[PDB]
């Protein structure tokens, strides 16, 4: 009854959630799920209490009734006197990475061009750069913008999949988890890395996490940031450092959605996991950092500092806000009220 039960996305998640569970001593227990979607489902079915989620896919389940209750949120300079958890949360840039040496190539030459997407849905690597597009573009076949792309959730035998690899074997090519070679920011950078795409769209923090010797991943040790260039929206290239000048948009952070009638426990049952887990808690160095993965995103991005209170009990459209509200509808129409499910 004061026990959460945490829905994984993938083999993976759920390595790394059973490893919380053990520490937790069953406050906190798994479900595991091969996509988000179905992870969403088993929320409202109840089988399952929570999830962290990308702004992409808490859209859709804020149509099916679920509710962000805390949030992910980094390091900051400006509101340095706020504790973490209080703290409000800054938001992150969805930028469009390229190679250095692949000169001459802009937001303008993009058409035809390979592409590598985070997954279908999701804030920085498909709603906003295929937003634009579309909206550019006139057309809402977007699905052949590109010639050939590794987009996370489509149709295996589509060009989307085309630059997907699966896992160790070429199993599972382009399913929406971590099994997939190029999936989230992390693969999708990897996809560009090793030039299996000519174009990323991720996270300006995940160009940082993964060069100059951050990662220490085979592929991402010998990788040095001035390779890199932004696509800016004036058609313009600029450096890795450049990127409050050349973002295409601010995303919402990642956060922890859960059914309404279980917020209130979740919430709970969480800041207390944190305390023990999370940056600075009795087990953090010692037993198990709830934040840390090795470079690899599960359960949470590496990145994040604190799970923080939201303040001001953010409906789904509140805390996505209306710019982005908008920015999915618009192209959800090309492919207005719901529950998907
Ligand atoms: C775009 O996104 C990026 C990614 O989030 C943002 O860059 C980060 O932004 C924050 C605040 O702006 C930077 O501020 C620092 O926060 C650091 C913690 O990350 C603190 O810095 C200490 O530790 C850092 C690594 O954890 C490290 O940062 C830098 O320095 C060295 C080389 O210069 C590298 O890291 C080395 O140290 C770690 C130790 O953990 C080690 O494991 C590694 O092997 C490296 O040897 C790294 O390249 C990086 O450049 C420093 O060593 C420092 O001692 C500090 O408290 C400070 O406040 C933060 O450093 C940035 N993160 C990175 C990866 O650099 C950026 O804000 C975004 N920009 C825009 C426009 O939004
Ligand atoms: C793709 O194209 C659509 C069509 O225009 C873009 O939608 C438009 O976006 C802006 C800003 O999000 C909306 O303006 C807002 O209007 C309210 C009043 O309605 C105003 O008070 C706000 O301050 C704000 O300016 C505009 O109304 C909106 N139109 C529609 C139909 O939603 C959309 O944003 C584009 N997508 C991308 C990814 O850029
Ligand atoms: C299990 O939850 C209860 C309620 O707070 C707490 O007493 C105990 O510390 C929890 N176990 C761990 C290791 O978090
Ligand atoms: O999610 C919190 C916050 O994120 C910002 O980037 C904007 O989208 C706001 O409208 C929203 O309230
Ligand atoms: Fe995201
Ligand atoms: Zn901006
Ligand atoms: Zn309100």
Same mark, same amino acid.
């Given at each position: ?22 520490? +937790?001593?069953?406050?906190?227990? #798994? $479900? ?5 979607? =179905?992870?969403? *489902?088993?929320?409202? /079915? ?111 035998? +589509?060009?989307?999949?085309?630059? #997907? $690899? ?5 199993? =599972?090519?382009? *399913?929406?988890?971590? /099994? ?162």
């Amino acid at each position: 009854y004061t026990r959460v039960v945490w829905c994984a996305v993938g083999p993976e998640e759920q390595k790394k959630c059973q490893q919380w569970s053990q520490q +937790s001593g069953q406050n906190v227990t #798994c $479900a595991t799920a091969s996509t988000t979607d =179905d992870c969403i *489902v088993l929320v409202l /079915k109840g089988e399952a209490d929570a999830l962290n989620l990308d702004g992409g896919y808490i859209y859709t389940a804020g149509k099916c009734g679920l509710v962000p209750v805390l949030a992910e949120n980094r390091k900051s300079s400006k509101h340095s006197s706020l504790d973490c958890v209080l703290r409000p949360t800054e938001g992150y840039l969805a930028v469009a990475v390229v190679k250095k040496a692949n000169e001459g190539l802009t937001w303008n030459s993009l058409k035809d061009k390979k592409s590598c997407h985070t997954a279908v849905d999701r804030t920085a690597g498909w709603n906003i750069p295929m937003g634009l597009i579309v909206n550019q573009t006139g057309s809402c076949a977007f699905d052949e913008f590109f010639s050939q792309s590794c987009a996370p959730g489509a149709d295996p035998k +589509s060009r989307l999949c085309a630059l #997907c $690899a699966g896992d160790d074997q070429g199993l =599972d090519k382009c *399913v929406p988890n971590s /099994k997939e070679k190029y999936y989230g920011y992390t693969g999708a950078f990897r996809c560009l890395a090793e030039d299996v795409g000519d174009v990323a769209f991720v996270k300006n923090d995940t160009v940082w996490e993964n060069t100059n010797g951050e990662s220490t991943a085979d592929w991402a040790k010998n990788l040095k940031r001035e390779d890199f260039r932004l696509l800016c929206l004036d058609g313009t290239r600029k450096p890795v450092t450049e990127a409050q000048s050349c973002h295409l948009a601010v995303a919402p952070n990642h956060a922890v959605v859960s059914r309404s009638d279980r917020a209130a426990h979740v919430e709970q049952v969480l800041l207390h996991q944190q305390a023990l887990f999370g940056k600075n808690g009795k087990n953090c160095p010692d037993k198990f950092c709830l934040f840390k993965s090795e470079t690899k995103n599960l359960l949470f991005n590496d990145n994040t500092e604190c799970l923080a209170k939201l303040g001001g009990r953010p409906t789904y459209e509140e805390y996505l806000g209306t710019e982005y509200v908008t920015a999915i509808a618009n192209l959800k129409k090309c492919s207005l009220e719901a529950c998907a499910f």
